[PDB]
Amino acid sequence: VPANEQISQLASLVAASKYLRVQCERSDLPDDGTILKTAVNVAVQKGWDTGRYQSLPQLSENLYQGLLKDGTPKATQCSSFNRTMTPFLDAMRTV
């Protein structure tokens, strides 16, 4: 599980959670920092070196903006993320 993919993956989870919060009105989800914390906690649960996650915050925000101009409708992106994100969002519950 190479570091750069670790980062793509985690940033995808971060970006999708923000998408949920804002585009799908998941008003139950917390701020971007707690979201980043979770992802980091999650990589640690996997014994991953989070000291290499310098680019993570920025890539996350770059993927989020990509999603907003992606042209897949919001109804669709929200159905998708609401379903696939559940374990991550459960993770957020303890941070």
């Binding site: 995808s12 989870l13 999708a16 999603l67 897949t72 998708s80």
Partner: peptide, 15 residues
């Protein structure tokens, strides 16, 4: 295709 990229990556993660 950011969404496809992102949904794919999420899928990878959950294996």
């Amino acid at each position: 295709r950011t969404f496809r990229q992102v949904q794919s990556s999420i899928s990878d993660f959950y294996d």
